[PDB]
Homo-oligomer: A and B are copies of this chain.
Amino acid sequence: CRNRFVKKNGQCNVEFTNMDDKPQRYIADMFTTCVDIRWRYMLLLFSLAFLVSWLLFGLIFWLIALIHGDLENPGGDDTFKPCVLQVNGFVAAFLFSIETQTTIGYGFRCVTEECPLAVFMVVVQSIVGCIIDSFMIGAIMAKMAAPKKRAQTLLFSHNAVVAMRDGKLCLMWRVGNLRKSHIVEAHVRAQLIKPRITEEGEYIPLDQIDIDVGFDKGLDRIFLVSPITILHEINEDSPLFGISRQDLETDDFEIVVILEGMVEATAMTTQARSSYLASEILWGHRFEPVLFEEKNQYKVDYSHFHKTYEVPSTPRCSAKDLVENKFLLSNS
């Protein structure tokens, strides 16, 4: 009922305000800023840069022609040589500027040996043109390769389940790869999200509490080919230790799940996220198997991926009740 901290699609539900220094901080960070904005704005920006330098040098060449007197004698003659042939006005200056910087160089408008300043300006513009190109190439390459997109070929089950596995009460959710290309050095994490008040009365608007997926033993590291069911064994140290099936219909909390790993092709790290609300957690359920063997290989049927079935033999009490009860029986 409270609210969702992280959407099922991985998107975070918080917005920032009253940030103070953001513009100056975004300028020092401008590259990050630049690759974060939408494609259409990034490109708009670069085409502006091209446009602006074309106009600028165009203006320079125009001025040079003006003062040198080339406007009235564009192609020269035996007695007169222009700084740049065929610049008759501003459009021509602009065209020349475009043809030089882009290195198209049609040649109708062309530099001559006449004016050291025009030759100089052609040197500057060629360099400046390489610089801008380099920036545009860099930004495009970067933004293109963005690894977070890989998270959309990665999959979490719509639900998480609670069931007995190997004698232990466990929280389980399913991750899968939608591509035949690997997630290298993949590993999982999970957190329980909810506000709480400490014993000193300090109010924590949202506390983030680890959910042990096997980090200490290195079992958080998975080799992901066909879908894996991720397991949190609920025990003395689990924030879920004292929670039973009925506490699930009542309580308001959220479990954030994460899967990190490197996109095989680029070895770049992507982070895939989802979330399970208390109401999205199915007590006493098990995931339908997606994997099966055929003659020469194994196949994953992905239409069973989200599916679960009831296991009525599942205990309805907390792992705490389960432990303590075990010790009334074992104790008498």
Judge whether A189 and B221 touch: CB under 8 Å: yes
Measured between beta carbons, the chain B residues less than 8 angstroms from A5 are 225, 298
Within 8 A of B (CB), among A98-118: 98-100, 102-108, 110-111, 113
A13-B297, A31-B145, A260-B185 known; A95 vs B108 contact (CB < 8 Å): no
Shortest C-beta distance, A102 to chain B (Å), equals 5
Alpha-carbon separation in the docked complex, A12 to B268 (Å)? 21
Chain B residues within 8 Å of A266, by CB:
35, 142, 145, 267-268
Contacts A134-B141, A226-B14; A165 near B202 (Cβ below 8 A)? yes
Closest beta carbon of chain B to A177's beta carbon, Å? 8
| A217 at the binding interface (Cβ < 8 Å) | yes
Q: Does A182 interact with chain B (Cβ within 8 Å)?
A: yes
Contact across chains for A149 and B181 when beta carbons are under 8 A apart: no
Closest to A286 in B: B202
Nearest-CB residue, chain B, relative to A134: B140
Complex Cα gap A297–B225 (Å) = 36
Question: A271: which of B167, B264, B293 is its contact (CB, 8 Å)?
Answer: B264
Does A246 lie at the interface of the complex (its beta carbon under 8 Å from any beta carbon of B)?
Answer: no
Q: A76 near B: Cβ within 8 Å? A: no
Please, what's the 1-or-0 string for A174-209, where 1 marks a CB less than 8 Å from any CB in chain B? 000011111011000101000000111011111010
Q: Is A80 an interface residue (CB 8 A)?
A: no
Q: Which residue of B lies closest to A15 (CB)?
A: B299
In the assembled complex, 9 residue pairs joining A and B whose CB atoms fall closer than 8 Å, in A order, are A12-B180, A17-B302, A30-B149, A104-B126, A134-B137, A138-B140, A166-B199, A185-B271, A191-B223
